[PDB]
């Protein structure tokens, strides 16, 4: 299930495409926070799928201080809390021997600050979508099984459309009204 689409559409929907795990092949035409210790970052990455960096005495930076509430929420062990507060004491001593720390302690604050949205409660299928690749290259026009069109234009889209319409058995979809991105996402969901 391989689809061809205008380049601006994939450019605008790259985030959703990455979130739904379809690989992107496109041709162009012309401060973060860190966790005190690696264990908490690993736990939060496992829970939410969000990559988190680790503080390594680099520069005056902004530190995230996970609080007792989220410590209990994430199921963190006693040793993790102990090492977190040990690193906290080390930071206290370092800044007393003359960096900003935030004690985030609500789940919504952490979500609205950084990271990916939590997981929904449905059965997990083998794959999120039935499509593997959406591309905008003439080099793999024979690779495609269907294509999508929009009133928006690309300098190479006309030739690709001509070379794709020549296929004997290919599914063709066109969008005329509403939002192009919403229609494309609905199609990629139902295809």
């Amino acid at each position: 299930a391989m689809l061809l689409a205008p380049g601006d559409v994939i450019k605008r929907s790259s985030e959703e495409l990455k979130q739904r795990q379809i690989q992107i092949n496109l041709i162009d035409w012309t401060g973060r926070w860190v966790v005190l210790t690696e264990e908490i970052a690993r736990a939060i990455e496992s829970k939410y799928g969000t990559k988190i960096d680790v503080y390594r005495d680099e520069v005056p930076a902004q530190i995230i201080e996970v609080e007792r509430s989220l410590q209990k929420e994430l199921g963190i062990s006693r040793e993790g809390v102990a090492e977190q507060t040990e690193r906290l004491r080390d930071l206290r001593r370092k800044e007393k021997s003359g960096i900003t720390i935030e004690g985030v302690m609500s789940q919504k604050k952490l979500l609205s600050m950084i990271g990916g949205v939590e997981r929904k409660m449905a059965p997990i299928g083998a794959r999120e979508s039935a499509v593997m690749l959406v591309s905008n290259s003439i080099k793999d026009v024979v690779r495609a099984t269907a294509y999508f069109t929009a009133p928006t234009g690309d300098p190479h889209w006309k030739e690709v459309a001509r070379e794709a319409s020549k296929k004997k058995n290919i599914l063709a979809y066109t969008s005329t009204g509403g939002d192009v991105k919403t229609e494309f996402l609905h199609l990629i969901d139902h295809l």
């Binding site: 069109t149 889209w157 006309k158 001509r162 319409s165 066109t174």
Partner: protein, 38 residues
């Protein structure tokens, strides 16, 4: 009376096209030409 639109590469169109009496003869002649292609 006009046909429902069909896609021409990337643009919709609704032209009737060639007459059915003319399209048939072309197809039959093409099949015959394929017969004596060798």
């Amino acid at each position: 009376i006009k046909t429902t639109p069909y896609l021409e590469g990337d643009v919709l169109s609704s032209d009737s096209g060639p007459l059915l009496s003319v399209f048939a003869l072309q197809e039959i002649m093409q099949k015959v030409r394929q017969v004596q292609a060798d």
